[PDB]
Amino acid sequence: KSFVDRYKYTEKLTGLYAQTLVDYSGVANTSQKPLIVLDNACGIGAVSSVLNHTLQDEAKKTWKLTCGDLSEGMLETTKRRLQDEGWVNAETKIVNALDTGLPDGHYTHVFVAFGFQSFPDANAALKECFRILASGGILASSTWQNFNWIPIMKAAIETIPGNLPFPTQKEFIALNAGWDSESYIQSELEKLGFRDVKVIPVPKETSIPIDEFFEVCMMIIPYLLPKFWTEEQRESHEKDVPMVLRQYLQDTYGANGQVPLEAVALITTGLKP
Ligand SMILES: C[S@@+](CC[C@H](N)C(=O)[O-])C[C@H]1O[C@@H](n2cnc3c(N)ncnc32)[C@H](O)[C@@H]1O
Ligand code: NA
């Protein structure tokens, strides 16, 4: 369980990628046909809010926005936002991304902003996206790749004698093989028939307090070091890693007790032929 697998550190960040996801989808580009859009797992409607502010009035006269989610509590909040912000031709309703009950070939755009990693069956949800998309429809999703926490841990390991092996941020990711992977997403989309698939990484800056950053690292090294250090290296150093890291973190970030850190989301786009 990494930092991006913890709701504590990602809940506050998902809103930062809503505008990004809308821009990459291309939805704001003028098109001939009317827009029929599904904000799948819309939550508090982060994407829907952006859509309504980004789209000009002419495209909104003829479009239909559906905000789907399985939580009534979040739909209650989203319908009040729909009202306050003056969304046009927008609706809220219960929609199971696993089993949407929505028509075949009906939507020009399906948005899934940080949903696939929450679904108990992401493959079922992806096939539903494909089914309900019309010809020429666009699937646009955002998912978590990682926090760039390896270089900080690495800087601490570097201070121990023995020039000890340790993965780069990339190598640790390949230990991990799902929607946090560009190659995996491209393959899963292309299998179902999506074309022109693009998976782009997008970084945003966040920070984690020293105390919590340390605790998470300590939950991970029991798995990570045995894979990279030999028995002899572990016997000499492994027990010292905790105090080394805590010392590094205090020396480096003790002034304000916060670890600056980059969060990377993957923006995915694909076209139903
Ligand atoms: C991390 S939030 C993302 C919310 C919003 N899309 C955003 O950009 O922040 C995940 C959302 O997916 C919803 N969800 C989880 N399982 C679902 C399912 N099977 N069908 C529809 N929504 C689901 C949850 O209710 C939650 O609001
Ligand atoms: Na992470």
CSV table of C-alpha atoms and ligand atoms in Angstrom, one decimal:
chain,number,residue,atom,x,y,z
A,1,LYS,CA,0.0,0.0,0.0
A,2,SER,CA,1.7,3.2,-1.3
A,3,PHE,CA,0.8,6.8,-0.8
A,4,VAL,CA,-1.6,6.8,-3.8
A,5,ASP,CA,-3.4,3.8,-2.4
A,6,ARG,CA,-4.4,5.9,0.7
A,7,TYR,CA,-7.5,8.1,0.6
A,8,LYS,CA,-5.9,10.3,3.2
A,9,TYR,CA,-3.4,11.8,0.7
A,10,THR,CA,-5.3,11.6,-2.6
A,11,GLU,CA,-8.8,12.9,-1.6
A,12,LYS,CA,-7.4,16.4,-1.4
A,13,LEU,CA,-5.7,16.2,-4.8
A,14,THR,CA,-8.3,14.7,-7.2
A,15,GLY,CA,-9.9,18.1,-7.9
A,16,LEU,CA,-6.6,19.4,-9.3
A,17,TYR,CA,-6.9,17.1,-12.4
A,18,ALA,CA,-10.6,17.9,-13.3
A,19,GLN,CA,-9.7,20.7,-15.7
A,20,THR,CA,-6.8,18.7,-17.1
A,21,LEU,CA,-9.1,15.7,-17.9
A,22,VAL,CA,-11.6,17.9,-19.6
A,23,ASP,CA,-8.9,19.6,-21.7
A,24,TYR,CA,-7.4,16.4,-22.9
A,25,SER,CA,-10.7,14.9,-23.8
A,26,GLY,CA,-11.3,17.5,-26.5
A,27,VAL,CA,-14.9,18.0,-25.5
A,28,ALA,CA,-14.6,21.8,-25.7
A,29,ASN,CA,-13.9,21.5,-29.4
A,30,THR,CA,-16.9,22.4,-31.6
A,31,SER,CA,-18.5,19.3,-33.1
A,32,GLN,CA,-21.4,18.7,-35.4
A,33,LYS,CA,-23.5,16.4,-33.3
A,34,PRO,CA,-24.9,17.3,-29.9
A,35,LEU,CA,-22.9,16.3,-26.8
A,36,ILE,CA,-24.3,13.5,-24.7
A,37,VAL,CA,-22.0,13.3,-21.7
A,38,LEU,CA,-21.7,10.9,-18.7
A,39,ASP,CA,-19.7,12.0,-15.7
A,40,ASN,CA,-19.3,8.4,-14.4
A,41,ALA,CA,-18.6,8.2,-10.7
A,42,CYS,CA,-19.0,12.0,-10.6
A,43,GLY,CA,-18.6,12.3,-6.8
A,44,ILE,CA,-19.2,15.9,-5.9
A,45,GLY,CA,-19.2,16.7,-9.6
A,46,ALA,CA,-15.7,18.0,-10.0
A,47,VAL,CA,-15.6,17.2,-13.7
A,48,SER,CA,-19.3,18.3,-14.3
A,49,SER,CA,-18.6,21.6,-12.7
A,50,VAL,CA,-15.6,22.2,-15.1
A,51,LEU,CA,-17.6,21.1,-18.1
A,52,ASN,CA,-20.3,23.7,-17.4
A,53,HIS,CA,-17.7,26.5,-16.9
A,54,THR,CA,-15.6,25.5,-19.9
A,55,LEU,CA,-18.3,24.8,-22.5
A,56,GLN,CA,-19.8,27.8,-24.3
A,57,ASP,CA,-23.6,28.4,-24.1
A,58,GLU,CA,-24.3,27.2,-27.7
A,59,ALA,CA,-22.9,23.7,-27.0
A,60,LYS,CA,-24.9,23.6,-23.8
A,61,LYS,CA,-28.3,24.3,-25.4
A,62,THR,CA,-28.2,21.0,-27.1
A,63,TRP,CA,-26.2,18.8,-24.8
A,64,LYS,CA,-27.3,16.4,-22.1
A,65,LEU,CA,-25.1,16.0,-19.0
A,66,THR,CA,-25.7,13.0,-16.7
A,67,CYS,CA,-23.9,12.9,-13.4
A,68,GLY,CA,-23.7,9.2,-12.3
A,69,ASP,CA,-22.6,7.8,-8.9
A,70,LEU,CA,-23.7,5.1,-6.5
A,71,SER,CA,-23.6,7.3,-3.4
A,72,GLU,CA,-26.9,9.1,-2.7
A,73,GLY,CA,-25.0,11.4,-0.3
A,74,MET,CA,-22.7,12.5,-3.0
A,75,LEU,CA,-25.5,12.9,-5.5
A,76,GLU,CA,-27.4,15.0,-2.9
A,77,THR,CA,-24.3,17.3,-2.7
A,78,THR,CA,-23.9,17.4,-6.5
A,79,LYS,CA,-27.6,18.3,-7.2
A,80,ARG,CA,-27.2,21.3,-4.9
A,81,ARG,CA,-24.0,22.2,-6.7
A,82,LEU,CA,-25.8,21.7,-10.0
A,83,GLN,CA,-28.4,24.2,-8.8
A,84,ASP,CA,-26.0,26.8,-7.2
A,85,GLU,CA,-23.6,26.9,-10.2
A,86,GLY,CA,-26.4,26.9,-12.8
A,87,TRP,CA,-25.6,23.8,-14.8
A,88,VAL,CA,-27.6,23.5,-18.0
A,89,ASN,CA,-29.5,20.4,-19.1
A,90,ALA,CA,-27.7,18.5,-16.3
A,91,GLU,CA,-29.1,15.7,-14.3
A,92,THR,CA,-28.1,13.6,-11.3
A,93,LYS,CA,-28.9,9.9,-11.0
A,94,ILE,CA,-27.7,6.6,-9.5
A,95,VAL,CA,-25.4,4.8,-11.9
A,96,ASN,CA,-23.4,1.6,-11.1
A,97,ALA,CA,-20.3,1.9,-13.3
A,98,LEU,CA,-20.2,-1.9,-13.0
A,99,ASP,CA,-23.7,-2.1,-14.5
A,100,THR,CA,-24.9,1.2,-15.7
A,101,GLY,CA,-28.3,0.3,-17.1
A,102,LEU,CA,-27.6,3.0,-19.8
A,103,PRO,CA,-28.3,2.6,-23.5
A,104,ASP,CA,-26.0,1.1,-26.1
A,105,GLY,CA,-24.1,3.5,-28.2
A,106,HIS,CA,-25.6,6.6,-26.7
A,107,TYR,CA,-22.9,8.9,-25.2
A,108,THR,CA,-20.4,11.0,-27.1
A,109,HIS,CA,-18.2,11.4,-24.0
A,110,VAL,CA,-17.7,9.3,-20.9
A,111,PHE,CA,-15.6,10.7,-18.1
A,112,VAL,CA,-14.2,8.5,-15.3
A,113,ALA,CA,-12.2,10.8,-13.0
A,114,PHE,CA,-10.4,8.6,-10.4
A,115,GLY,CA,-12.9,5.8,-10.6
A,116,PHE,CA,-11.2,2.7,-12.1
A,117,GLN,CA,-8.9,2.3,-9.0
A,118,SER,CA,-12.0,2.5,-6.8
A,119,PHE,CA,-14.2,0.0,-8.7
A,120,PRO,CA,-14.3,-3.6,-7.3
A,121,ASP,CA,-14.1,-4.7,-11.0
A,122,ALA,CA,-12.4,-2.1,-13.2
A,123,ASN,CA,-12.6,-4.4,-16.3
A,124,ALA,CA,-16.4,-4.7,-16.0
A,125,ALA,CA,-16.7,-0.9,-15.8
A,126,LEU,CA,-14.4,-0.3,-18.8
A,127,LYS,CA,-16.5,-2.6,-20.9
A,128,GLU,CA,-19.6,-0.7,-19.8
A,129,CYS,CA,-17.9,2.5,-21.0
A,130,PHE,CA,-17.2,0.9,-24.4
A,131,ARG,CA,-20.8,-0.4,-24.7
A,132,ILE,CA,-22.6,2.9,-23.9
A,133,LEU,CA,-20.3,5.0,-26.1
A,134,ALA,CA,-21.6,5.9,-29.5
A,135,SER,CA,-19.4,5.6,-32.6
A,136,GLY,CA,-16.8,8.3,-32.4
A,137,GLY,CA,-17.3,8.5,-28.7
A,138,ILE,CA,-14.5,9.5,-26.4
A,139,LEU,CA,-13.4,7.8,-23.1
A,140,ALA,CA,-11.4,10.1,-20.8
A,141,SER,CA,-10.2,8.9,-17.5
A,142,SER,CA,-7.8,9.9,-14.7
A,143,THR,CA,-6.1,7.5,-12.4
A,144,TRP,CA,-3.2,7.6,-9.9
A,145,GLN,CA,0.3,6.5,-10.9
A,146,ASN,CA,2.4,7.3,-7.8
A,147,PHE,CA,3.8,9.9,-5.4
A,148,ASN,CA,7.5,10.6,-6.1
A,149,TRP,CA,8.6,9.3,-2.7
A,150,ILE,CA,11.4,7.0,-3.8
A,151,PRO,CA,14.1,9.8,-4.3
A,152,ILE,CA,13.6,10.9,-0.7
A,153,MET,CA,14.0,7.4,0.7
A,154,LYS,CA,17.0,7.0,-1.7
A,155,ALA,CA,18.7,10.2,-0.4
A,156,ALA,CA,18.5,8.6,3.1
A,157,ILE,CA,19.8,5.3,1.9
A,158,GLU,CA,22.8,7.0,0.2
A,159,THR,CA,24.1,8.1,3.6
A,160,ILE,CA,24.7,4.5,4.8
A,161,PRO,CA,28.0,2.9,4.1
A,162,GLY,CA,28.2,0.3,1.3
A,163,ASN,CA,26.6,2.2,-1.6
A,164,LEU,CA,23.5,0.1,-1.1
A,165,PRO,CA,21.2,-0.9,-4.0
A,166,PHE,CA,17.8,0.8,-4.3
A,167,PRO,CA,15.2,1.2,-7.1
A,168,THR,CA,14.5,4.3,-8.9
A,169,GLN,CA,10.9,5.7,-8.9
A,170,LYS,CA,10.2,3.8,-12.1
A,171,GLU,CA,11.5,0.4,-11.0
A,172,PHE,CA,9.5,0.4,-7.8
A,173,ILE,CA,6.4,1.0,-9.9
A,174,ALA,CA,7.1,-2.3,-11.8
A,175,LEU,CA,6.8,-4.4,-8.6
A,176,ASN,CA,1.9,-1.8,-9.6
A,177,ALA,CA,0.7,-3.6,-12.8
A,178,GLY,CA,-2.8,-2.1,-13.3
A,179,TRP,CA,-4.3,1.4,-13.9
A,180,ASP,CA,-1.1,3.0,-12.4
A,181,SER,CA,0.7,1.8,-15.5
A,182,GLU,CA,0.6,3.5,-18.9
A,183,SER,CA,1.3,0.3,-20.8
A,184,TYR,CA,-1.4,-1.6,-19.0
A,185,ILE,CA,-4.0,1.0,-19.8
A,186,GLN,CA,-3.1,1.2,-23.4
A,187,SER,CA,-3.4,-2.5,-23.7
A,188,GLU,CA,-6.7,-2.9,-21.9
A,189,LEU,CA,-8.3,-0.1,-23.9
A,190,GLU,CA,-7.0,-1.4,-27.3
A,191,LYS,CA,-8.3,-4.9,-26.5
A,192,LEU,CA,-11.9,-3.7,-26.3
A,193,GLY,CA,-11.6,-1.8,-29.6
A,194,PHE,CA,-10.6,1.7,-28.5
A,195,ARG,CA,-8.4,3.5,-30.9
A,196,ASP,CA,-6.1,6.6,-30.8
A,197,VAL,CA,-5.3,5.7,-27.2
A,198,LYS,CA,-3.1,8.2,-25.3
A,199,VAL,CA,-1.9,7.9,-21.7
A,200,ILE,CA,-0.2,11.1,-20.4
A,201,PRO,CA,1.4,11.6,-17.0
A,202,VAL,CA,0.6,14.8,-15.2
A,203,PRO,CA,2.4,16.0,-12.1
A,204,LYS,CA,1.0,18.1,-9.2
A,205,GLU,CA,2.8,19.3,-6.1
A,206,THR,CA,1.7,18.2,-2.6
A,207,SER,CA,3.4,17.6,0.7
A,208,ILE,CA,3.3,15.1,3.6
A,209,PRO,CA,4.2,15.7,7.2
A,210,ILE,CA,7.5,14.1,8.3
A,211,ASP,CA,5.7,11.9,10.9
A,212,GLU,CA,3.3,10.3,8.4
A,213,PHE,CA,5.9,10.1,5.6
A,214,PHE,CA,8.2,8.1,7.9
A,215,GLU,CA,5.4,5.7,9.0
A,216,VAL,CA,4.4,4.9,5.4
A,217,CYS,CA,8.0,4.2,4.4
A,218,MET,CA,8.4,1.9,7.4
A,219,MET,CA,5.4,-0.1,6.2
A,220,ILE,CA,7.1,-0.6,2.8
A,221,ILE,CA,10.8,-1.4,3.5
A,222,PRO,CA,10.0,-4.8,5.0
A,223,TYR,CA,9.1,-5.8,1.5
A,224,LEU,CA,11.4,-3.6,-0.5
A,225,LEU,CA,14.8,-4.2,1.1
A,226,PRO,CA,14.8,-8.1,1.0
A,227,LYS,CA,14.2,-7.8,-2.8
A,228,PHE,CA,17.2,-5.5,-3.3
A,229,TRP,CA,19.7,-6.2,-0.5
A,230,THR,CA,21.6,-9.5,0.1
A,231,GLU,CA,21.4,-11.3,3.4
A,232,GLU,CA,24.8,-9.8,4.4
A,233,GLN,CA,23.8,-6.3,3.6
A,234,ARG,CA,20.5,-6.6,5.5
A,235,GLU,CA,22.3,-8.0,8.5
A,236,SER,CA,24.6,-5.0,8.6
A,237,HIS,CA,22.2,-2.2,7.8
A,238,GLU,CA,18.5,-3.1,7.7
A,239,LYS,CA,17.9,-2.5,11.4
A,240,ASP,CA,19.5,0.9,11.1
A,241,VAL,CA,17.3,2.1,8.2
A,242,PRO,CA,14.5,3.6,10.5
A,243,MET,CA,16.7,5.9,12.5
A,244,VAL,CA,18.6,6.9,9.4
A,245,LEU,CA,15.5,7.9,7.6
A,246,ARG,CA,14.1,9.8,10.6
A,247,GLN,CA,17.4,11.6,10.9
A,248,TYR,CA,17.5,12.5,7.2
A,249,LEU,CA,13.9,13.8,7.3
A,250,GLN,CA,14.6,15.9,10.4
A,251,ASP,CA,17.8,17.3,8.9
A,252,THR,CA,16.2,18.0,5.5
A,253,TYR,CA,12.6,19.1,6.4
A,254,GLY,CA,12.6,19.8,10.1
A,255,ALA,CA,12.2,23.5,9.6
A,256,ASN,CA,8.5,23.2,8.8
A,257,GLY,CA,8.0,19.5,9.3
A,258,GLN,CA,6.7,18.8,5.8
A,259,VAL,CA,8.0,16.7,2.9
A,260,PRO,CA,7.3,18.3,-0.5
A,261,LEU,CA,6.2,15.7,-2.9
A,262,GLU,CA,5.0,15.3,-6.5
A,263,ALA,CA,1.8,13.3,-7.2
A,264,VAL,CA,1.5,11.9,-10.8
A,265,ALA,CA,-1.9,11.1,-12.3
A,266,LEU,CA,-2.3,9.4,-15.7
A,267,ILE,CA,-4.7,11.1,-18.1
A,268,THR,CA,-6.2,8.5,-20.6
A,269,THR,CA,-8.1,9.2,-23.8
A,270,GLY,CA,-9.5,6.7,-26.4
A,271,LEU,CA,-12.0,6.7,-29.3
A,272,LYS,CA,-14.6,4.1,-30.0
A,273,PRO,CA,-14.5,3.4,-33.8
B,1,LIG,C1,-12.2,9.0,-5.7
B,1,LIG,S1,-13.9,9.5,-6.0
B,1,LIG,C2,-13.8,10.4,-7.5
B,1,LIG,C3,-14.9,11.4,-7.6
B,1,LIG,C4,-14.8,12.4,-8.7
B,1,LIG,N1,-15.0,11.7,-10.0
B,1,LIG,C5,-13.5,13.2,-8.8
B,1,LIG,O1,-13.0,13.5,-9.8
B,1,LIG,O2,-12.9,13.4,-7.7
B,1,LIG,C6,-14.6,7.8,-6.5
B,1,LIG,C7,-16.1,7.9,-6.7
B,1,LIG,O3,-16.5,6.7,-7.3
B,1,LIG,C8,-17.7,6.3,-6.7
B,1,LIG,N2,-17.9,4.8,-7.0
B,1,LIG,C9,-17.3,3.8,-6.3
B,1,LIG,N3,-17.8,2.6,-6.9
B,1,LIG,C10,-18.7,3.0,-7.8
B,1,LIG,C11,-19.5,2.2,-8.7
B,1,LIG,N4,-19.5,0.9,-8.7
B,1,LIG,N5,-20.4,2.9,-9.6
B,1,LIG,C12,-20.4,4.2,-9.6
B,1,LIG,N6,-19.6,5.0,-8.8
B,1,LIG,C13,-18.8,4.4,-7.9
B,1,LIG,C14,-17.7,6.7,-5.3
B,1,LIG,O4,-19.0,7.0,-4.8
B,1,LIG,C15,-16.8,8.0,-5.3
B,1,LIG,O5,-17.7,9.1,-5.3
B,2,NA,NA,2.9,6.2,-4.1
